[PDB]
């Protein structure tokens, strides 16, 4: 990829499970007689990781739009390999086992996912406001999760109850059918532009769609598709 970057061509770089790079390094280090660091990992974990990742950079001559995948041992996010990966990124995405088990298959955890360009100067003021509100609301639900779990939904205040229902609708709404995942969910794939995503979530937070049951936010595109599904259901 570096040859094409150096001559000015824009490069899309997809590296899969950088974690197996780290794991192979760990196995080789174990065979090499090095003293293991932390959980059986190589002592030169950070250095190897940096040597790989500092070459993944958009320079002045050309740009590389890297898009990696990382495997966390089981569901452990404190493992040394992802722990070293997290500082080597501009945008982080976290996939949770619990969300996937709920069939919300894009499975991105909004609270554990961040980005550097989620700044109103870059991405836009309305986009930033909607994203930050969708994280605040998501947080409220995580804080009230146990309260809902044991006691129930009725002991919350009216506004807490409304934010919990909106949070559940938001969770269901991040689900999106994919063209490549059409085999699993029969629904065809949906390409939702970022502007339509911002409009849809702004409308969802504004109060529009409160009357709609949460079941209609599952595997849909923009808010217009949700409204159309509700109208078809009457």
């Amino acid at each position: 990829a570096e040859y094409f970057r150096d001559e000015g061509r824009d490069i899309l770089l997809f590296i899969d499970n950088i974690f197996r790079f780290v794991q192979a390094g760990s196995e080789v280090s174990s065979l090499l007689g090095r003293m293991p660091s932390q959980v059986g990992y190589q002592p030169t974990l950070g250095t190897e990781m940096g040597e790989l990742q500092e070459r993944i950079t958009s320079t002045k001559r050309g740009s590389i739009t890297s898009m990696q995948a990382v495997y966390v041992p089981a569901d452990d996010y404190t493992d040394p390999a992802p722990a070293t990966v997290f500082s080597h990124l501009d945008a982080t995405i976290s996939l949770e086992r619990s969300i996937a088990e709920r069939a919300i298959f894009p499975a991105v955890d909004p609270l554990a996912s961040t980005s550097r360009i989620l700044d109103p100067n870059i991405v836009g003021e309305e986009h930033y406001r909607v994203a930050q509100e969708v994280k605040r609301v998501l947080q409220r639900y995580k804080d009230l999760k146990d309260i809902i779990a044991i006691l129930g939904m009725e002991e919350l205040s009216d506004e807490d109850k409304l934010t919990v229902q909106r949070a559940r609708k938001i969770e269901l709404f991040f689900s999106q059918p994919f063209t490549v995942a059409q085999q699993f969910t029969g629904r065809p794939g949906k390409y939702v532009p970022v502007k339509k995503t911002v409009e849809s979530f702004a409308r969802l937070l504004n109060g529009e769609g409160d009357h709609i049951p949460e079941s209609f936010f599952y595997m849909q595109g923009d808010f217009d598709d949700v409204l159309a599904a509700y109208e078809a259901s009457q």
Partner: protein, 285 residues
Amino acid sequence: PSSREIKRRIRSVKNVAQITRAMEMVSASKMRRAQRNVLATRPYADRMREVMANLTARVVGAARRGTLLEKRETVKSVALLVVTPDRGLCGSLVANVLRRAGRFITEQRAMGRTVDVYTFGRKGRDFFLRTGFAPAGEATRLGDAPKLEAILGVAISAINGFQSGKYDELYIIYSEFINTLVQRPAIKQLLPVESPDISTTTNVDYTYEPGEEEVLNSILPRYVETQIYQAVLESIASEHSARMVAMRNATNNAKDLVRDLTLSFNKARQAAITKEVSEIASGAA
């Protein structure tokens, strides 16, 4: 999740489970005594029920069907009575009764009838204050065994409003005690429209010493007050039953969460032991 925070969480949810089980037990005793009170109030209610049936059997002419017995035409103002728990933890009971009251207000305003609220219990009072309606009549701090004298402050006001033309009809919303587990909100008409029951069919002829009209005007308000007292006691029993069910569900959920947290704690404990022995072995070598 460090095998010590989870231990604290387990202790916390165990305390939750103990408190919730205690709440369930006391709510069971509360339901027992509230059912006893309802059954002890039943004789007055049913005796007055057939007395009213007999009285309205004789008073059949429209001219003498006046005061509280009149079936007013062109209804313009409607009052609804709501009885709610004074405290929370009742589960969906408070939400159910308030949803029923709100939708009933919706239909009553749909036909053009202005609506006024009369509330028993702090939950309904607070909800209707927050939503906008000023409580025309407010009564709270009603114990599990309220006396009929405690309801007069609202019932007499409603009856006087109906007498003065302020309200053209009267309703009550209360939690019916269908079962120990199943309770729904219910709607009842407070303008008499009495039933032609066997008593109404009964033709036992009577003598009314103070006068038929005076006996009518003195017994209709007491019959309405008896109906409201029955509804309030029914709602108290339903409150305690709903709290029992809610606390049983909460105790079961707390036990399930204790089980899950114990599994997580055991996993963390094993992980900690494995980590420390691995570190010690690495240091030895």
